[PDB]
């Protein structure tokens, strides 16, 4: 059930997220948050966040979550809006591996968790 069980290829990981990493760098709207983040540690978001979207709830208790996210919200002015933003440049990236709707619809759903959302706004 590992992410390469799913694809099947190292190499597909290494494009898969170098498409999203291209398209999140295009949006000078949410790097304003990764100002403080090195592109080191950056990428290694993407591909953490790429993967819990195919469900990879491998290990995510939380807790550390909120706080990490919190340090944001206390200096960044964190919204809602954010959240809607790169979510749908995922959803863009999807249409771009010429994949069905149906498939893609189901992705919303995961990543519509409203606890995973609830734990951005750190409530
Ligand atoms: C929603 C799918 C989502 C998840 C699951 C997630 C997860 C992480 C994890 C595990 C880390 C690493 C924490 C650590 O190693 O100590 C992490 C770091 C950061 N995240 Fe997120 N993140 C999710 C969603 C978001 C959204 C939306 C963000 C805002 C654009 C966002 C930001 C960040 C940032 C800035 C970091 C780095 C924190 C740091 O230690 O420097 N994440 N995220």
Known sequence: ASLYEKLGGAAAVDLAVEKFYG?????ERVNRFF???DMAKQKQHQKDFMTYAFGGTD???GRSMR???QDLVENAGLTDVHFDAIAENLVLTL????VSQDLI???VTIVGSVQ???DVLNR
């Not at 249409?95 to 010429?98: P, S």
């Open 23 to 27: 398209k999140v760098l295009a949006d």
């Open 35 to 37: 100002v403080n983040t």
């Open 59 to 61: 290990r995510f208790p």
């Open 67 to 69: 706080a990490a996210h």
């Open 95 to 98: 249409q771009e591996l010429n």
């Open 105 to 107: 619809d189901e992705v």
């Open 116 to 118: 995973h959302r609830n």
